[PDB]
Design a protein around this motif. Sequence first.
Motif, PDB file in Angstrom:
ATOM      1  N   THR A  70       0.853  -1.177   0.000  1.00 44.95           N
ATOM      2  CA  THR A  70       0.000   0.000   0.000  1.00 44.95           C
ATOM      3  C   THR A  70       0.893   1.232   0.000  1.00 44.95           C
ATOM      4  O   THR A  70       2.029   1.184   0.478  1.00 44.95           O
ATOM      5  N   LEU A  71       0.378   2.334  -0.553  1.00 45.86           N
ATOM      6  CA  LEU A  71       1.189   3.539  -0.705  1.00 45.86           C
ATOM      7  C   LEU A  71       1.725   4.043   0.630  1.00 45.86           C
ATOM      8  O   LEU A  71       2.802   4.647   0.672  1.00 45.86           O
ATOM      9  N   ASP A  72       1.000   3.817   1.726  1.00 43.77           N
ATOM     10  CA  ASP A  72       1.532   4.192   3.032  1.00 43.77           C
ATOM     11  C   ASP A  72       2.616   3.225   3.501  1.00 43.77           C
ATOM     12  O   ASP A  72       3.632   3.654   4.057  1.00 43.77           O
ATOM     13  N   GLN A  73       2.416   1.919   3.298  1.00 41.83           N
ATOM     14  CA  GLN A  73       3.458   0.954   3.638  1.00 41.83           C
ATOM     15  C   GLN A  73       4.703   1.149   2.787  1.00 41.83           C
ATOM     16  O   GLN A  73       5.815   0.864   3.243  1.00 41.83           O
ATOM     17  N   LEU A  74       4.537   1.619   1.550  1.00 42.20           N
ATOM     18  CA  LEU A  74       5.689   1.857   0.689  1.00 42.20           C
ATOM     19  C   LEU A  74       6.622   2.903   1.283  1.00 42.20           C
ATOM     20  O   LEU A  74       7.847   2.735   1.261  1.00 42.20           O
ATOM     21  N   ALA A  75       6.066   3.991   1.816  1.00 45.64           N
ATOM     22  CA  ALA A  75       6.901   5.021   2.421  1.00 45.64           C
ATOM     23  C   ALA A  75       7.614   4.513   3.667  1.00 45.64           C
ATOM     24  O   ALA A  75       8.698   5.002   4.001  1.00 45.64           O
ATOM     25  N   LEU A  76       7.027   3.540   4.363  1.00 45.39           N
ATOM     26  CA  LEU A  76       7.664   3.006   5.561  1.00 45.39           C
ATOM     27  C   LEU A  76       8.835   2.092   5.223  1.00 45.39           C
ATOM     28  O   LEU A  76       9.813   2.039   5.976  1.00 45.39           O
ATOM     29  N   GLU A  77       8.760   1.371   4.105  1.00 45.19           N
ATOM     30  CA  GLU A  77       9.816   0.442   3.723  1.00 45.19           C
ATOM     31  C   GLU A  77      10.871   1.092   2.837  1.00 45.19           C
ATOM     32  O   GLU A  77      12.069   0.885   3.051  1.00 45.19           O
ATOM     33  N   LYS A  78      10.450   1.871   1.844  1.00 46.02           N
ATOM     34  CA  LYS A  78      11.359   2.527   0.906  1.00 46.02           C
ATOM     35  C   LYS A  78      11.018   4.008   0.881  1.00 46.02           C
ATOM     36  O   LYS A  78      10.381   4.496  -0.062  1.00 46.02           O
ATOM     37  N   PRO A  79      11.430   4.757   1.905  1.00 47.87           N
ATOM     38  CA  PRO A  79      11.128   6.195   1.921  1.00 47.87           C
ATOM     39  C   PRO A  79      11.722   6.952   0.750  1.00 47.87           C
ATOM     40  O   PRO A  79      11.121   7.930   0.289  1.00 47.87           O
ATOM     41  N   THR A  80      12.882   6.536   0.249  1.00 44.61           N
ATOM     42  CA  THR A  80      13.510   7.193  -0.887  1.00 44.61           C
ATOM     43  C   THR A  80      13.171   6.542  -2.220  1.00 44.61           C
ATOM     44  O   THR A  80      13.613   7.035  -3.263  1.00 44.61           O
ATOM     45  N   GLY A  81      12.405   5.453  -2.219  1.00 48.46           N
ATOM     46  CA  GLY A  81      12.021   4.830  -3.469  1.00 48.46           C
ATOM     47  C   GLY A  81      13.112   4.052  -4.164  1.00 48.46           C
ATOM     48  O   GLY A  81      13.028   3.838  -5.375  1.00 48.46           O
ATOM     49  N   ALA A  82      14.140   3.625  -3.436  1.00 44.44           N
ATOM     50  CA  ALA A  82      15.245   2.905  -4.050  1.00 44.44           C
ATOM     51  C   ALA A  82      14.782   1.567  -4.608  1.00 44.44           C
ATOM     52  O   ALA A  82      13.938   0.887  -4.018  1.00 44.44           O
ATOM     53  N   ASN A  83      15.342   1.198  -5.763  1.00 43.45           N
ATOM     54  CA  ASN A  83      15.064  -0.081  -6.418  1.00 43.45           C
ATOM     55  C   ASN A  83      13.587  -0.207  -6.794  1.00 43.45           C
ATOM     56  O   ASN A  83      12.931  -1.208  -6.503  1.00 43.45           O
ATOM     57  N   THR A  84      13.063   0.828  -7.448  1.00 43.58           N
ATOM     58  CA  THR A  84      11.674   0.863  -7.880  1.00 43.58           C
ATOM     59  C   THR A  84      11.598   1.337  -9.324  1.00 43.58           C
ATOM     60  O   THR A  84      12.501   2.008  -9.827  1.00 43.58           O
ATOM     61  N   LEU A  85      10.505   0.974  -9.991  1.00 41.53           N
ATOM     62  CA  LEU A  85      10.207   1.459 -11.334  1.00 41.53           C
ATOM     63  C   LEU A  85       8.747   1.881 -11.409  1.00 41.53           C
ATOM     64  O   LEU A  85       7.864   1.166 -10.926  1.00 41.53           O
ATOM     65  N   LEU A  86       8.498   3.045 -12.000  1.00 39.85           N
ATOM     66  CA  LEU A  86       7.153   3.578 -12.152  1.00 39.85           C
ATOM     67  C   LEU A  86       6.534   3.111 -13.463  1.00 39.85           C
ATOM     68  O   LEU A  86       7.234   2.856 -14.447  1.00 39.85           O
ATOM     69  N   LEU A  87       5.206   3.006 -13.472  1.00 36.72           N
ATOM     70  CA  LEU A  87       4.472   2.559 -14.646  1.00 36.72           C
ATOM     71  C   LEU A  87       3.219   3.404 -14.822  1.00 36.72           C
ATOM     72  O   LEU A  87       2.677   3.947 -13.858  1.00 36.72           O
ATOM     73  N   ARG A  88       2.766   3.509 -16.071  1.00 40.97           N
ATOM     74  CA  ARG A  88       1.532   4.202 -16.411  1.00 40.97           C
ATOM     75  C   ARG A  88       0.679   3.323 -17.313  1.00 40.97           C
ATOM     76  O   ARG A  88       1.163   2.371 -17.927  1.00 40.97           O
ATOM     77  N   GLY A  89      -0.605   3.662 -17.393  1.00 35.80           N
ATOM     78  CA  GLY A  89      -1.503   3.024 -18.324  1.00 35.80           C
ATOM     79  C   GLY A  89      -1.564   3.765 -19.644  1.00 35.80           C
ATOM     80  O   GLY A  89      -0.984   4.844 -19.802  1.00 35.80           O
ATOM     81  N   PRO A  90      -2.269   3.202 -20.623  1.00 37.21           N
ATOM     82  CA  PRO A  90      -2.407   3.882 -21.920  1.00 37.21           C
ATOM     83  C   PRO A  90      -3.374   5.056 -21.870  1.00 37.21           C
ATOM     84  O   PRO A  90      -4.586   4.865 -21.742  1.00 37.21           O
TER      85      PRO A  90
END
Lengths: 183, 53, 104, 53, 78, 62
Positions: A120-140
């Motif tokens: 979840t977006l809140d759990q994400l900030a708790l585990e990876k506050p800086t977003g290391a080792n992540t990739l963003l995606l979008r829809g069409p």
Amino acid sequence: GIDLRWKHVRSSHRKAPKSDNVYLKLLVKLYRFLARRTEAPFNKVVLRRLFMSRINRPPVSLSRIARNLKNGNEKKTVVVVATVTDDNRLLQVPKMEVAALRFTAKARARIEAAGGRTLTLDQLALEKPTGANTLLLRGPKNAREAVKHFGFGPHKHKKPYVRSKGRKFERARGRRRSRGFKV
Amino acid sequence: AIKHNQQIPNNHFRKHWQRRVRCHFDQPGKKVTRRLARRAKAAALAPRPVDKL
Amino acid sequence: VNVPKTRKTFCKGKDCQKHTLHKVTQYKAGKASAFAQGKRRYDRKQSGYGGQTKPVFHKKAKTTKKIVLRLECSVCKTKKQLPLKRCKHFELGGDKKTKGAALV
Amino acid sequence: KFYHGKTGVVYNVTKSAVGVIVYKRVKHRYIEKRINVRIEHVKPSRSREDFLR
Amino acid sequence: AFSKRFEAKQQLESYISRVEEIISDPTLSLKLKRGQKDKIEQALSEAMAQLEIEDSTADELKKKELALKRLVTKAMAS
Amino acid sequence: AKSKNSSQHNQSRKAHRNGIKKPKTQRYPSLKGTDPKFRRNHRHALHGTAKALKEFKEGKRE
RNA sequence: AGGUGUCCUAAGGGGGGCUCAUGGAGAACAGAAAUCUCCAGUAGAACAAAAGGGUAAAAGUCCCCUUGAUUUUGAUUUUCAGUGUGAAUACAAACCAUGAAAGUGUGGCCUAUCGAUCCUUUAGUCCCUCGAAAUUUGAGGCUAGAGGUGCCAGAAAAGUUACCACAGGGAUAACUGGCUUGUGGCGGCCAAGCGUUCAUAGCGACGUCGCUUUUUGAUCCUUCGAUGUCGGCUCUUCCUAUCA
RNA sequence: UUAACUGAACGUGGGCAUUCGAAUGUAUCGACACUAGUGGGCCAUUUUUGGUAAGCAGAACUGGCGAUGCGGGAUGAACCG
RNA sequence: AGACUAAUCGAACCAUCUAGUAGCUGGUUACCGCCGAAGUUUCCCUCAGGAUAGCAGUGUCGACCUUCAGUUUUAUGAGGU
RNA sequence: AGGUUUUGCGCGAGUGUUUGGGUGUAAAACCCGCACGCGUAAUGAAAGUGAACGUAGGUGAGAGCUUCGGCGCAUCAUCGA
Ligand SMILES: [Zn+2]
């Protein structure tokens, strides 16, 4: 006199969500604090995408996720600030961990069945506050029915507004050289 | 008088349509009437089934 | 304006597909039928009371017509149609003109 | 007669003609134009020779 | 058709004989060029010729009436 | 009755109101209008050069 | 200041030999002007038509052979909304003409010479449908031409009202007022001449500079939910270009 | 396509910044969606057409009134600041 | 005499269809803040009217893309006032 | 009533209980399902036929991530199936 061309010109982008969801208001407070006191560019991008309207957050599918899980990306974390949808075509689902705004009922079941984890977006900030080792995606963005009618005109090959389709509806003059001309 | 990119309209509203409009405000009132008729009929046919094969 | 009775040009026949001798003849429109769909509809619209129901043209301005040549292959009996410009003189088979033989 | 004196860029070459691309100024916007010219009318231009030198 | 054709035949013959006077007299031909003369007489060649055929109608006679008149009238006018 | 026929008094100011926009140039122009005979062969040329460069991993090594 | 609703089986396409209008000098009938010969000759000639541009071993002229004025569709230029119609340019795939050959040819040397939906009619393939199943007539479909709208992006159309009506217009006339003064009226300058002789006692040709708004025109700014539109009678005042 | 790997386009590899190769500015970069009013205009400098001329009729570039107050021209939609 | 037919006649009076249609006149109700026009192109039995392009507002997204300009300099073309 | 773009919300390759039935403190509230509507497949007048050579393609730009080598969303242009 000052002889200026522009004056009192406003901004062009949203600065706050128009929705009144109470939980979304809390989520904006967290990431507004993170972006101010962190050097990671990943946080600033996530903040703006929370403001966007529904047509600017198109759904992504399980197949689109599996497409980008190749060539050395099997260990990264997928973050999608949108909904995530199950795909009926994909028969075998790989192992992955996903952080998304919300999941459909079937997408959540199949992800955890293979041995994955849904965040979840809140759990994400708790585990990876800086977003290391992540990739963003979008829809069409342009894969919408309403977009096919944009910019209709001669020699444009767009879609017309017709109450039905058949040989009695348009065609005829202006669509074939046998009756006058063509477009 | 069309002005922009529109769908060509066809609304059949040139007769005196206002004289024949049938609003349904008695939808719940009618339902009560049918239920009173069924249970009244079932009482008359005491041991028999209501329907037919 | 006169044109020869015969000329050889392309033939779109199934087996010719090459230049072949043709005979040249003028085209004439046929008689209007009494069973076409347009005629059958017109007859019903005029029956009964009401009068004339479709327009009748009155203001003509053109003085000439375009001439259409009908050709015929000498082998497969295939026909062609070649339009011309507007003209007063049409004749097939006329004699050629003579140069330098002036006399009154 | 509009193109008598303008300068363009070749985009197609054929047996005895070349295709040139020139920019025409209609009111409030520019439009790309493509014309076919026989080689008796075209001529190489020294506009870019100073730069290449 | 017989009368209309015969009338137009007379009018075309009348105009051919009329123009023969212009091309024949020396006063007008002195200042009138060879290049127009031989083309008018060239047109006159098939003009005498088409009289021999019998299928010619009134339309043909009127056409060659005006074609001959325009051709000769440019020479006479200028 | 009679009225003004034509004018061009305010057209120049209207055009420059929000700029005279020049279409952007770009790296790869379209191949519309080029003669077909050269166009057919160019298609075959690109087909071969892709296969040869794909074989660079188990092959020619030019 | 002018032009178009046409004309051409060659006045279209290919190839070859030749050079025009005009001027000079010569030859029986022969003269200003009939036919022949020599020299000079930058186009002063010719090219279907209005005008402009273009052309000399040609685009002119004569001779020889021919039908690229043909078939299937796309891209581009001009008027332009970068829609339609007209006309025009460059290629591709076939079949031909001409020439020893390179080459040229998709109508007239270039700029004008023409036409939608619906309906009718002809050519083409050997094609699809008539919905219970077959076979022949007939009818209906797909692709390309013709029959026409000149008010030419294309309704089917004769008058009168002085017996008259309605919605509006000072976007528009008939009367005043305003600007202008050609015409109308009035006044100057120069001096050939008239005036017994002597330009100016009294006049003034050929020319030329002004004023006025009691003539008539030009214009259409103000009034069409209204400014009572000829003449005479009566009565007051002002202007001077002065009849007493 | 050429007598011809001779050309032609699109390519692999490599070389060239110590300085990415005129001035000034960047108080305003690109794309898309939906829709309001308007389609009677008038005036001025220079150029300019018909007319004896007009506060008359018709055009080209730019600035104005209309849509706008303030200080000057005694007054005066358009002149000067 | 287009005269008279209940103060009405170049076609009487009463009710209904009928709130008959109008490219034409008249009117259209509180405050503050920000931006801010057009009388021009093409077609229409079109010229007191409509559609089409232009000028205008609002909603945004892609980058903060280093891209641009009603301007000057340098090199090189066209024109017939 | 029928269209169209934009904003908020639920579910999501599906979605919509209320024509109707069960029930009720009774024009409220609550529950149930067979069909059906739109969407998931286009193209021709029609008989008809019907979407993978490749890790769902190649090239130039792209936010972000990175073991620093590189992998590269959305979208724009271009060549192919
Ligand atoms: Zn044949």
